[PDB]
Structure 1
Amino acid sequence: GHREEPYLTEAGRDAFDKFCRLHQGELQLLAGGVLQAPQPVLVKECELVKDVLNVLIGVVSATFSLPESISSLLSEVAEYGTCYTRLSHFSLQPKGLVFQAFTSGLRRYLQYYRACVLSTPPTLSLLTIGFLFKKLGRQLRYLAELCGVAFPTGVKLLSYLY
């Protein structure tokens, strides 16, 4: 035998990063070197799994600030966390009494969201985490349009939510 030497279309995650490097090299030749992207390899799948597991807590690894195509995947699961933190800052305050009861109900929903993470995944794959938090994430972002982050308090709230 001398080994038939297979196609490149049946190969990837090692040929993929190589072929992406070749594509970037052709593009940087055709531009003249005025493009300059960092980290063409990294981040992997499982490290991003642990990172997005940390992102749903409300903390970051300082990747955001207020392969490389996965950022095109990452942003839509990124923009969920950026509104989720923006609700907990809207519950940082201990106001109306009906407004206090309203905000304690919002914190009781945040407790559900904090409980779903670290209890469902025993380190599942990335796209499963994204797909499970697709039908749930837009529902959470809907509540950011519901809440203030003026915003009504008292009767002007009690008829508005009614």
Structure 2
Amino acid sequence: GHREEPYLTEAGRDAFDKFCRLHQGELQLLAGGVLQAPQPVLVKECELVKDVLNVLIGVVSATFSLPESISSLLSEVAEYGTCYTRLSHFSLQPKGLVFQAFTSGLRRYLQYYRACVLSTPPTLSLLTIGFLFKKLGRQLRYLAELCGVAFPTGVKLLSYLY
């Protein structure tokens, strides 16, 4: 025998890596050598999954600054932590007394968001993250429209929320 030998409908995880490498080489030739790509893997899958779980804690990785389809999944899950941080620094105080009660009530949700990640998962697949943190991460981004990040405060804010 000789084994029909992997087809396009067939094998992945090595032919898939081979395929994407070849297509990237095709783009590089088709420009003239003036298109430049970053590293095609970063750096693995499971290690990357744990890295993006750490992004949800509130620490963004040092690969961010203020396959190739990984970028499309990655931006959507990356921006969640950057707006979580944009809530936490506008919750840093120890004015409006009801406004301070409002700020601690915001902490009541931010702590829940920090608690749900990395107290649930042993390991999950990459796409599970993007599906799972859709009903919750968009809900986190809803609160940024609520906050200013003037800005009505005190009884004015309390009465609008009423």
Moved over 4 A (4+): none
Shift of 1:5: 2.0
Structure 1 window deviating more from structure 2 (135-144 vs 34-43): it is 34-43
In structure 2, what is the equivalent of residue 115 of structure 1? 115
Q: How far apart in 2 are the matches of 1:111 and 1:27?
A: 45
Shift of 1:160: 1.4
Q: Judging changes above 3 Å, is the alpha-carbon distance between structure 1 residues 6 and 125 closer, same or farther for their aligned structure 2 residues?
A: closer
Mind listing any 5+ residue stretches in structure 1 that lack a counterpart?
Answer: none
Matched residue SS, 1:49:
helix
Mind listing any 5+ residue stretches in structure 2 that lack a counterpart?
Answer: none
Shift of 1:113: 0.9
Listed one character per residue, the Cα deviations across residues 86-116 of structure 1 (whole Å, up to 9, x for unaligned) are: 0001101222100000000001111111111
In structure 2, what is the equivalent of residue 27 of structure 1? 27
Matched residue SS, 1:160:
helix
For the 8 Å contact 1:49–1:126, the answer to whether it is kept is yes
Q: Aligned Cα RMSD in Å? A: 1.4
Q: TM-score, normalised by structure 1?
A: 0.93
Q: TM-score, normalised by structure 2?
A: 0.93
For the 8 Å contact 1:43–1:67, the answer to whether it is kept is no
Shift of 1:19: 1.3
How many residue pairs end up in the alignment? 162
Identity %: 100
For the 8 Å contact 2:20–2:68, the answer to whether it is kept is no
Shift of 1:7: 1.4
